[PDB]
From a paper:
Suppressor of cytokine signaling (SOCS)2 protein is a key negative regulator of the growth hormone (GH) and Janus kinase (JAK)-Signal Transducers and Activators of Transcription (STAT) signaling cascade. The central SOCS2-Src homology 2 (SH2) domain is characteristic of the SOCS family proteins and is an important module that facilitates recognition of targets bearing phosphorylated tyrosine (pTyr) residues. The SOCS-SH2 domain conforms to the canonical SH2 domain structural fold and is distinguished by an additional α-helix N-terminal to the domain, designated the extended SH2 subdomain (ESS). The SOCS box, a conserved 40-residue motif at the C-terminus of the SH2 domain, forms two alpha-helices and is constitutively associated with the adaptor proteins Elongin B and Elongin C, which function to both stabilize the SH2 domain and recruit an E3 ubiquitin ligase complex consisting of Cullin5 and RING-box protein (Rbx).
Here, we have discovered an exosite on the SOCS2-SH2 domain that, when occupied by a peptide (F3), reciprocally enhances the affinity of the SH2 domain for its canonical phosphorylated ligands. Crystals of a 1:1:1:1 complex (F3:SOCS2:EloB:EloC) were obtained and data processed to 3.1 Å. F3 bound as an α-helix on the opposite side to the phosphopeptide binding site, in a shallow groove formed by the pTyr-binding loop (defined as the BC loop) and the ESS helix. Residues 4–14 of the peptide were visible and the buried surface area of F3 when in contact with SOCS2 is 400Å2 (PISA36). The side chains of Ala33, Leu36, Ala37, Leu40 from the ESS helix and Leu81, Leu82, and Tyr99 from the SH2 domain, form a cradle to complement the hydrophobic face of the F3 helix, consisting of F3 residues Leu7, Met8, and Trp11. In addition, F3-His6 forms a polar network with side chains of Tyr49 and Asp74, although the resolution precludes a precise mapping of the interactions. Although electron density for the full Lys10 side chain is not visible, the most favorable rotamer for lysine would position the terminal amine at an ideal distance to interact with the cluster of backbone carbonyls formed from residues His77 and Tyr80 and both side chain and carbonyl of Ser75. Although F3 binding efficiently enhances SOCS2-SH2 domain affinity for pTyr ligands, our structure shows that F3 does not directly contact residues involved in binding phosphotyrosine or residues within the hydrophobic +3 binding pocket. F3 binding caused a significant (~10-fold) reduction in the rate of dissociation (koff: 0.245 ± 0.003 to 0.0235 ± 0.001 sec−1 with F3). Given that the crystal structures in the presence and absence of F3 (within the limits of available resolution) are essentially indistinguishable, but F3 binding significantly decreases the off-rate of bound phosphopeptide, the most likely explanation is that F3 stabilizes the conformation of the BC loop in its bound form and hinders dissociation events.
Author numbering:
A (entry chain A): 31 to 112, 115 to 136, 149 to 198
B (entry chain D): 4 to 14
C (entry chain C): 17 to 45, 58 to 84, 87 to 112
D (entry chain B): 2 to 104
Amino acid sequence: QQAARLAKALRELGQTGWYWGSMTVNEAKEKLKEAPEGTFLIRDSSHSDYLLTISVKTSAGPTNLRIEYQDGKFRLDSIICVALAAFDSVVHLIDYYVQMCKDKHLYLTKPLYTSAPSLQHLCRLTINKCTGAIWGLPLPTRLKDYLEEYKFQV
Amino acid sequence: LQHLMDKWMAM
Amino acid sequence: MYVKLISSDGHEFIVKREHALTSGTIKAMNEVNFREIPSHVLSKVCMYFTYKVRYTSTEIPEFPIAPEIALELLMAANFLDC
Amino acid sequence: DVFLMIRRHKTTIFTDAKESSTVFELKRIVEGILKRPPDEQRLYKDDQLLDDGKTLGECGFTSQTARPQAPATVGLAFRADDTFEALCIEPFSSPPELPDVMK
């Protein structure tokens, strides 16, 4: 189920609207130079050993953090980071850290969209922030299925 | 993103 | 230049035709009556049209949606295909 | 740019204009849409009547305060016959109660 999980993860990632594909390291730094702290995007990694990279503005400038995928689990770069949580879903990973800085670790706040999300998707995002009990909502089955397709808050 | 599928399949 | 979109409660919203064409439904079909979309939703839909056109400097800002209208807005968005 | 909602009764116009433009130019836009001359229009920010000659910036319509996603409301009253009608804007509908799960 290893390849099947990565395929599902990449479908979600295409659904995020903040995946910048083949953006170069220099292009990512140029895009985030003046962005607020916490602003982030995901792009392809240029390194042979890694699939993806998170580009994020820190108080010291834009930086890059590669994402490992091993044994069917996603985790942040273990060469840089060391109780590192693992995730079936990489969008879930991002969501996890995003929520983690709404409490108190990795400071991620607002994604950098490639283009304007659809209104449907923004409504889905808003509803996910309010409840996980999508089935209990006064909505038609077709829209619950749509909500079911993307359960994350970012 | 079939490019990423094949990159993982390679490595 | 402009089109008129009328809510179920009879509020008339006048928006640039270019902006209104964000909705595939409107694009396919100079007044449009929706009868099933109330004004507190249609107005926010029109604000979405404005927001989408202005940010399509990609520093796209957040588009805030009040929890109290979100379910209805979703249905409207699904109806409008936007 | 400043993004505006011009509201009278059950009519709402979504439009944009420069912060540097005047009240009169906005009345000319209204005249192009609703077919009433400038001298038969009064525009308001809350209860405050706006003078034709003032710029939008001096009236308090800033790019920070009037965004595409949150336009500022400008009220509109027409000159019915001799005088002006009272500034009347009908509110939008009320949202239903949230489901419990949305707590």
